[PDB]
Symmetry: C5
């Protein structure tokens, strides 16, 4: 049998959130689900929507409704996106990707996962053409990582051995090299 | 399917509450819902009402009932408002609004949201006429904020370009100016 | 729809309880409800009763049952009252009331609520006649509080203007005087 | 209506448990209930049984099953008792009782409850004959407690006034003497 | 009646997890159950699967789906095993077992349980033949433990008295020797 009901994800909109809160992009997934999918009455949608909000973000929702009583939940979410959503230039998406380097004590397979989230944003905002993202991924790994020289021998084969690797192919080759023998 | 049942909001009435408690004005929303809407028996209403109370506030509820056994939940909430509700002069509503200035490291869009809660109280208590609240909002932002001079050029257009802006219009113009370019 | 099920109130019987526990007089309300009202089987009553106990208090319940297998839940609660309940002389109820004075930084309306719990105990235990409790309340407020002199002018009217005030009447007159004007 | 479902009691088997865990003798009550009483399918019994285990204790359960696939839950609990249960000589039960004295700031009624748990273990393990446990209780209270001399006058009546008192009789006489008068 | 629904086990994939998280080998049991057994719709499986993930591990799941929309839950778990699963040579399994010695203040029955988890891994990965695991267990206990000399007399009988003992037989003989007499 399906286990315990799952708690709502949550969001404050604060300049420094609590470590249990989500990104706006993820709270907006839960909110889009509640709006589009749930078989529920409007005031019960609105009480489930309201129950997820904290911080400053809870405080906007009342102001917007009082000034327009005809507001649907589909319209109220459009006001919520303007105040708490995100604005970022093409140049900022591009510069924020290319500046990313491996940290102290971070593993190479941890770095290559962290770096892949930034490459998707830069391809959405048309900063990088989708035609060349697999070449741009390999060039940035060899630029930013602290590769051991047996790993260096393999990545230099992938650079030359036909087309550039996919994400899961590159991630496999890295994992085979990360393992150490005990003493 | 609708997710986990939602916890009751809570209130102590203490001089310093726990950071999880609500304002009396919000606990009184939950209490007004339980009183007016829920399809429930009186002793079960009263056990749900009681379950939300803590601090000193829990302690009043017994005293009031013993001295009048005929008391309805509609009458018991009227006694609760007298002891824990709020009293504020017209002059205090007006002075408490006009004294409000931007804090250290606070953003201009955070300040303009914080300031809008105070303008609604002052218009309820008839301190500010509802006829002029959109003019009074722009005059207080230019008085209290630490505007950069490219933002200053735009707000001085809004001051002259016909009628004064609404809340969401002003909030849009501010957000377009707050964003910075990376290096 | 009625919201989430409510957690059991709890009791340790310890010399210093955790701050989440209740007075014995309140845990005994929940226990009296479970005994008298719930439509449940005996071993399920006894498992709900048991689930609320902690500290030393949990440890008594087994000893009492082993020595008398015929024990009903109505009889087992009578043993529980003897060991954890309260004993207090008429003279201690009277002296513990009359010694009560306003604390550092406590408000007058907070003091007059705190003092009313003690006057009910002293009238149950026949230390104070129920005929005169409204006179005894006003005499103790003027004895124990740190009244400002505009409040002093009003309470000295109530002392002379016919019969002494009720609890909610006195509490109204105090609240009208507690409010301050901003600068 | 019966209130919220009750959380499982829990057990680690560790040399120092968390303060929320039970004695093995109490986790084994919950486990005996799940085994004998619940109207449930075997793999769902085994998933409820498993869900209560932590620490080292969780880790044994897998090893035992792999080496004998025909194992019933009635047989698997017999292996669990051998590794985490308790072994104690007749002489250790007797010596551990007789050495028990009142602590700093402990009340006499708290001591006489704490001491009664130890007398039951010593009568199970046949160290003390059940024929004489009420005499042995009074002799140990007068040996171990720090009695005031008005309490001393009453316990010396109980020693001589026919048969020795029961547990609840002795506990009543002690409670009547513990109370103090205010000043 | 079966008690409260049980919380999901959880996993971050982080280099240092929170102390409430499981090993990947145990989160993968819960995930294999959800995939194979639960009578549920695909998007509700995927929302239950997703709800258990945190840390870096939550972040992989989106990337994999976007690059192949035809992916089943049976295929998505195969990608999850490659990135977060475990790689270990035959020589590392063997060396990691044989190096294991008793710690400061650890009991002999606690050591012999801790050591048995390592012997199962080394027999899965074909480092130790299953034909001889009961001999290899006794040789490692006499090598690694700090045995008292009355325990030494008994284990030297088991070494010679026909076939080597099973796990529960050896664990019984150790437990009979660990107990001490009070003073």
């Amino acid at each position: 049998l399906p286990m315990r009901y799952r708690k709502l994800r949550v969001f404050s909109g604060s300049a420094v959130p609590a470590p249990e809160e989500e990104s706006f992009e993820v709270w907006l997934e839960q909110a889009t689900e509640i709006v589009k999918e749930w078989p529920v009455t409007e005031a019960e949608k609105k009480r489930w929507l309201a129950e997820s909000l904290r911080g400053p973000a809870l405080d906007l929702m009342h102001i917007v409704q009082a000034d327009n009583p005809s507001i649907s939940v589909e319209e109220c979410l459009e006001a919520f996106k303007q105040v708490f959503g995100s604005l970022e230039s093409r140049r900022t998406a591009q510069v924020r990707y290319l500046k990313t380097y491996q940290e102290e004590g971070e593993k190479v397979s941890a770095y290559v996962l962290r770096l892949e989230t930034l490459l998707r944003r830069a391809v959405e905002k048309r900063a990088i053409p989708r035609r060349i993202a697999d070449q741009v991924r390999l060039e940035q790994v060899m630029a930013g990582a602290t590769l051991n020289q047996m790993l260096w021998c393999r990545l230099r084969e992938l650079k030359d051995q036909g087309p550039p690797p996919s994400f899961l192919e590159l991630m496999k080759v890295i994992r085979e090299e990360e393992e150490e023998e005990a003493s």
